[PDB]
Design a protein around this nucleic acid. Structure first.
Ligand SMILES: Nc1ccn([C@H]2C[C@H](O)[C@@H](COP(=O)(O)OP(=O)(O)OP(=O)(O)O)O2)c(=O)n1
Ligand SMILES: [Cl-]
Ligand SMILES: [Cl-]
Ligand SMILES: [Cl-]
Ligand SMILES: [Mg+2]
Ligand SMILES: [Mg+2]
Ligand SMILES: [Mg+2]
Ligand code: NA
Ligand code: NA
Ligand code: NA
Length: 326
DNA sequence: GTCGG
DNA sequence: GCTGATGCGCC
DNA sequence: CCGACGGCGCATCAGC
């Protein structure tokens, strides 16, 4: 793609800052620069040209100058040749191992998948699951399979109570031809900002999905969020489907539009949308859009009747989910 | 790492 | 148990 | 050691 060299470089640096340096703001700066550069509709011919974009400063402009001149960056060469860095970065790819645990493990000489397997007693349940399905979770899900999964989920939710409404969000709702995982937004009339009437509204759905063997394991679970694992059933003498990650989020029904905006993403579109909201004097989360009063504190939630209404408050032209991907 | 108070 | 900080994760 | 930077759910740890 156009300017793919540059956005790959900046992404790789981003992941280094997050996973090795533990520098989440440098991670976020590298993410933002890559984002702006990717939507820039010309070939970047210099770092100066790039510097003009919001989120590109001197140091990134200089890196872009090097890469444009040489087709590589020495900094990233050194990082790739550092075995310790590589090991730490690699371990964070296990679901449940973040930058902190990855550094702890590598400090104790645990550097490979083999090592994690030999030292399974050192892992929490989440991590054990991340490891068990490490290969599967590296793979994307074709949209064809996402359709089957949607259909299993909607049907089983329908069977618990026909008043539930389940919406597959994330990259799927953005129309992607493959997805990293399944993200499901769930609402029920009994759960609103004003009132929780039923207990166990999420629980009911999860247990039903476990009962039909769709959901296979649980990473974490509370009253409104479920993180876990699921699997399509497969046909005889045909290899199984990979196990997949699934996220379910129960949102107050009167807050559907804020929730579906959050859960549709992308992640960087969300952060950028929320960033623009702050400079417009608003704050947005998955529940509400609120005005910022001086003293910092946010005021009452503003009424919202559509996804677009949230765009309106901050004066962004509406973006279809298609055009919310990076 | 970048931008803005 | 609490409050608050950290570590994991989600978009 | 200019500080903010998007915002939060679930699990767990420190200091009560
Ligand atoms: N864009 C910047 C740059 C620096 N600082 C901070 C860092 C210091 O804690 C404080 C005062 O730094 P200086 O004395 O360097 O700023 P001066 O304006 O006094 O420098 P000069 O003597 O160049 O005019 O401001 C800031 O708030 N915003
Ligand atoms: Cl940082
Ligand atoms: Cl809403
Ligand atoms: Cl809120
Ligand atoms: Mg997803
Ligand atoms: Mg997800
Ligand atoms: Mg994601
Ligand atoms: Na810039
Ligand atoms: Na991880
Ligand atoms: Na509108």
């Amino acid at each position: 793609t156009l300017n793919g060299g540059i956005t790959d470089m900046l992404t790789e640096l981003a992941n280094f800052e997050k996973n090795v340096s533990q520098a989440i703001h440098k991670y976020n700066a590298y993410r933002k620069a890559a984002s702006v550069i990717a939507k820039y509709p010309h070939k970047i011919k210099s770092g100066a040209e790039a510097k003009k974009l919001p989120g590109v400063g001197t140091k990134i402009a200089e890196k872009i100058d090097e890469f444009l001149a040489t087709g590589k960056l020495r900094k990233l060469e050194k990082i790739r040749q550092d075995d310790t860095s590589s090991s730490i970065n690699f371990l964070t790819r296990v679901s449940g191992i973040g930058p902190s645990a990855a550094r702890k493990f590598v400090d104790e000489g645990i550097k490979t998948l083999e090592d994690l397997r030999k030292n399974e007693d050192k892992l929490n349940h989440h991590q054990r699951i991340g490891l068990k399905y490490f290969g599967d979770f590296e793979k994307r899900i074709p949209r064809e399979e996402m359709l089957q999964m949607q259909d299993i989920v909607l049907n089983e939710v329908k069977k618990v109570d026909s008043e539930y409404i389940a919406t597959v969000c994330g990259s799927f709702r953005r129309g992607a031809e493959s997805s990293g995982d399944m993200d499901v937004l769930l609402t029920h009339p009994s759960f609103t900002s004003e009132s929780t009437k039923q207990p166990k509204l999420l629980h009911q759905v999860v247990e039903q999905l476990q009962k039909v063997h769709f959901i296979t394991d649980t990473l974490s679970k509370g009253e409104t969020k479920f993180m876990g694992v699921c699997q399509l059933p497969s046909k005889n003498d045909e290899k199984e489907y990979p196990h997949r990650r699934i996220d379910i989020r129960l949102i107050p029904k009167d807050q559907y539009y804020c929730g579906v905006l959050y859960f549709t993403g992308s992640d960087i579109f969300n952060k950028n949308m929320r960033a623009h909201a702050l400079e417009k004097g608003f704050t947005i989360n998955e529940y509400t859009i609120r005005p910022l009063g001086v003293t910092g504190v946010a005021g009452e939630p503003l009424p919202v009747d559509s996804e677009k209404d949230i765009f309106d408050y901050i004066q962004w032209k509406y973006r279809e989910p298609k055009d919310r991907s990076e």
